[PDB]
């Protein structure tokens, strides 16, 4: 005999758009926790891997402002992450010879070799994580998420980002 | 005349599963930045709103271990967020009368009234953010993201979570 007055209340039924935000949050946390443990032996968080990857796309050297433009994160966050990486020996900062006050940021050989290793592990980890959804589901998920990013990024980022135009296939 | 040797390199073409992780990350950051600015006048981060919401589903009072079980975040994070909320006057912690060392956590009247306000603003914000995708796209996005959460959460959370079974419609 089911007990009375103990079933879910009205706050467990959400607008679909709110449930989508819960879903996005839960998958981002679930996948990050699993990937971060597999990458532990290289001491990479997801943000340090993202910054290594963007600098690889830039030919291994750039400036803080160009890297910030290319990546979704806030610039103060980009700067904090780069400073952590500098202390890990992954990034070398040098004074630009021309512009007083401008910094150039360059990946070390150690960091490029770490990225070698981390990209191969990372690709295996994302594939095994997403093996439960089909190619077509993956294709439509990227299209829908891309529509959402294109609609929402300009609400707070007004010409400040020119995100790296990643391709697949 | 297009300059030579300056086009994207091979690190800009990703495995689809890696591009999906970039997409998830970018939408989570884009939507959070926009929602957090609209909710500023109530001094809520997304995590404090999530904890207020889960405690509302629990009838406004619970214990740290039950709240942790119901929410995706790590328990040390849940605890840090609850302590911040206690300092904001949103949560009252009391010693359980029976169990030595057990804490009960209860929302204050101020917090329930804040949640009133925040839920109504939040629902408007998520709707306007997601107005670019159709009902059917929203429905399929929740189904795909739910498959991904169900496959990936058990890789690191082994019977430690019993996430709140949110419904829509
Ligand atoms: O590889 C990446 C580049 C950028 C971002 Cl935001 C995430 C990842 Cl994994
Ligand atoms: O309302 C919520 C409940 C849980 C989580 Cl993880 C996110 C939100 Cl918005």
**What domains can you pick out in chain A, each with its CATH number?**
1-169 (1.10.10.10)
Measured at the CA of A52, the angle between CA A33 and CA B10, to 5 degrees, comes to 110
To the nearest whole Å, the CA of A9 is away from the closest chain B CA by 6
Identify all chain A residues contacting B34, using CB atoms and an 8 Å cutoff: 152, 155-156
Three-state SS string across chain A, please?
A: CCCCCCCCCHHHEECHHHHHHHHHHHHHHHHHHHHHHHCHHHCCCHHHHHHHHHHHHCCCEECHHHHHHHCCCCHHHHHHHHHHHHHCCCEEEEECCCCCCCEEEEECHHHHHHHHHHHHHHHHHHHHHCCCCCHHHHHHHHHHHHHHHHHHHHHCCCCCCCCCCCEEC
Q: Return the bridge partners of B94, or none.
A: B104
Residue of chain A with shortest Cα separation from B11: A57
Phi-psi region of A25 (alpha: psi -120 to 50; beta: other; left: phi over 0): alpha
- Give the SS3 label for residue B106: strand
Q: Which atom of ligand 2 is nearest to the CA of B72?
A: 6
Tokens coding B133: 């995708």
Q: Return the bridge partners of A41, or none.
A: none
Q: Return the bridge partners of A107, or none.
A: A91
Distance CA A98, CA A93 (A): 15
To the nearest whole Å, the CA of A95 is away from the closest chain B CA by 24
Ligand 1 pocket test: pick from A48, A53, A123 the residue with the most ligand atoms within 8 Å of its Cβ.
Answer: A53
Q: Cβ of B33 and A127 within 8 Å?
A: no
Ligand 1 pocket test: pick from A50, A57, A68 the residue with the most ligand atoms within 8 Å of its Cβ.
Answer: A50
Q: Is the CB of A53 under 6 A from ligand 1?
A: yes
Query: Are the CB atoms for A96 and A61 separated by under 8 Å?
Result: no
Distance CA B32, CA B159 (A): 29
CB neighbourhood size of B110 (10 A): 11
Q: What are phi and psi of B93, to 5 degrees?
A: -105, 130
Distance CA B89, CA B87 (A): 5
Q: Is the CB of B157 under 6 A from ligand 2?
A: no
Best of B7, B11, B119 to substitute, by most chain A Cβ atoms within 10 angstroms, is: B11
The dihedral sign for the CA sequence B83, B87, B91, B95: positive
Q: Cβ of A168 and B122 within 8 Å?
A: no
At what resolution in Å was this solved?
1.7
Identify which ligand lies nearest to the alpha carbon of B81: 2
| Residue among B42, B45, B17, B20 at smallest CA distance from B33 | B45
Rounding to the nearest 10 degrees, give the CA dihedral for residues A26, A32, A33, A38: 150
A116 HSE (CA, 13 A, CB side): 7
Measured at the CA of B28, the angle between CA B22 and CA B30, to 5 degrees, comes to 95
For this PDB entry, the determination method is: X-ray
Q: Return the bridge partners of A95, or none.
A: A103
Q: What are phi and psi of A13, to 5 degrees?
A: -110, 120
Please report how the helices B109-129 and B16-38 are oriented relative to each other, as an axis angle in degrees rounded to 10. Answer: 130
Distance CA A88, CA A43 (A): 9
Question: Cα(B159) to centroid of ligand 1, in Å?
Answer: 30
Using CB atoms, pick whichever of A19, A135, A147 lies closest to residue B142. Answer: A19
Enumerate residues 6+ apart whose C-beta is below 8 A from B96. B63, B102, B103, B104
Distance CA B92, CA B104 (A): 8
Identify all chain B residues contacting A12, using CB atoms and an 8 Å cutoff: 57, 164-167
Q: What are phi and psi of A88, to 5 degrees?
A: -75, -5
Query: Are the CB atoms for B72 and B161 separated by under 8 Å?
Result: yes
| Residue among A58, A145, A23 at smallest CA distance from B11 | A58
Q: Cβ of A149 and B9 within 8 Å?
A: no
Place of tokens 């709103």: B49
Strand order in the sheet with A91-95: A61-62, A103-107, A91-95
Strand order in the sheet with B103-107: B61-62, B103-107, B91-95
| Residue among B130, B144, B15, B19 at smallest CA distance from A150 | B130
């Amino acid at each position: 005999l089911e007990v009375l007055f103990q079933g879910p209340n009205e706050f467990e039924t959400l607008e679909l758009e709110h449930l989508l935000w819960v879903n996005i949050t839960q998958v981002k946390h679930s996948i990050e926790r699993a990937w971060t443990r597999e990458l532990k032996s290289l001491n990479l968080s997801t943000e340090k891997f993202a910054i290594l990857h963007e600098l690889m796309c830039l030919g291994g050297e750039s400036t803080p402002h160009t890297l910030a433009r290319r990546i979704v994160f806030e610039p103060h966050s980009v700067s904090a992450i780069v400073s952590r990486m500098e202390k890990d020996g992954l990034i070398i900062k040098t004074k630009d010879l021309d512009k007083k006050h401008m910094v150039r940021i360059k990946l070390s050989e150690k960091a490029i070799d770490t990225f070698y290793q981390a990209l191969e592990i990372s690709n295996r980890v994302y594939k095994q994580m997403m093996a439960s959804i089909t190619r077509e589901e993956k294709v439509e998920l990227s299209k829908t998420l891309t529509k959402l990013r294109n609609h929402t990024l300009p609400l707070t980022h007004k010409h400040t980002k020119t995100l790296t135009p990643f391709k697949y296939i």
